[PDB]
Symmetry: D2
Subunit: 149 residues, 4 copies
């Protein structure tokens, strides 16, 4: 019997982004300006600070390393650390890097968000591992967060 893994979609972080700044493989920084969080029991707004600090590998692959927060309706403040990778066929990666729209289903964009809260309700966010499956647009990054069971 081959080993099995079960996961569960729980919620979606949409993060609004701004212009990129590049250091020169290549280090670049993309500011997080806002956004929202939506799922069963989760409703909150991404806070207007933080950035994704990225490395572009020589093969056009993107190491993502974002640190931000969100605040739920409850008053729970949740620190987000979202680490991962975006890859796929090279010509499609050059389109995104331009701002030109690409179908997210054709791209590989997977992350591991970690969460930190002291809020008693959202302690579960620290007791499980999560995998994100994301989508890149010019103005936003849509992350579908799945709970590893």
């Amino acid at each position: 019997m081959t080993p099995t893994l079960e996961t569960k979609y729980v919620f979606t972080i949409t993060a609004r982004i701004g212009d990129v700044t590049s250091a020169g493989g290549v280090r670049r920084i993309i500011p997080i300006l806002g956004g929202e969080v939506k799922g069963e029991g989760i409703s909150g707004q991404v806070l207007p600070f933080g950035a994704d600090f990225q490395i572009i590998r020589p093969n056009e692959l993107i190491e993502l390393e974002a640190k931000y927060a969100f605040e739920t309706d409850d008053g729970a403040v949740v620190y987000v650390e979202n680490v991962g990778i975006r890859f796929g066929p090279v010509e499609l990666l050059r389109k995104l890097k331009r701002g030109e729209p690409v179908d997210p289903k054709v791209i590989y964009f997977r992350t591991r968000p970690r969460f930190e809260t002291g809020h008693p309700n959202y302690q579960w966010l620290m007791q499980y591992l999560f995998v994100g499956s994301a989508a890149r647009h010019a103005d936003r990054v849509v992350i579908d967060v799945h709970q590893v069971l």
Copy 2:
């Protein structure tokens, strides 16, 4: 609803030595568990965990365990893969307290293994995310590795 696809790729069995503890360090007990060896098995994959490295753990006040293991394996065809395996182990307090034998299907024990190699046939190990589902026994940790698609 958003969906996520994964697939079993291989199992890492890391043999572990004696626990060394640094004590309580403000934020959870720092403990270290030497890696002595082991095996890596899967489709077309056959290798040995090299005899060095450690798991560096933090135990939180609540018996939850943050894991951070850094070690390596070598496949039969000569690929050397550096492994950074970061995770959490959790469950009923009594069972966590139990080096007595416990059934793994009650413990939450999931990790994110991240791989580095130069071997042409394992490049895919750095181009995907992976999730581990692990089981702890007294002499070894058995880690089933699933590729996130």
Copy 3:
């Protein structure tokens, strides 16, 4: 007995914003401190810190603060330097408790040292990645001043 030589090289000054707190992780209190501008300054390296990134912190039960600031400046040459500044702030607990209420405490009487690491592709500031650096820092209400010293 072994010796260590260092050289003061330049001063950072990251203008920080309102504090946002996430609370107890069981292992300390997590807080975030945006960085919205400010200046780097010294010999042959003048520049501006950029209005993004933040200080992400843990406050230990004993009230020591471990800092991890990730931010960037751009110099006159047009170099973009990415900075990661990891450090600690400690002292007798009374003085530390004044430092959040936003009270002027003389930086000499408080221990605030960091290790700032740099990344550039710019061929003129390549030396930033070839040495280790130590910040000796100081805490204010609106700003934070960072004396960068090169380890030789």
Copy 4:
């Protein structure tokens, strides 16, 4: 206008016995290599310890031969503290001499830039100070060992 100053004080030396290089290869950013830590000693005033027989330095050699170090190990003192060490830094120098070091050939440590930031974690009451200061290490690479002179940043 007064040029800021930094004061340090030498506190102790860590001598780590190192094993054979395992190399994972080119990772697109440099070459990943791993060097097992076999033992060693810690010594200074009011600190005397033995480096425990486990751990490793996880390294990246950049294409200019700069080495990024990231060593994780532990020592135990004679009076019963266990201290976890995370030692992160760089080794650089003239390429010929870096290559000499790779071949296990003796080089004078003065011509090699070899500096790190050691970070300690311990529960032991007497060594609590190890997590209350920043430290800088000035080190030396030999064929069989690494010698880090640890300085407390004041």
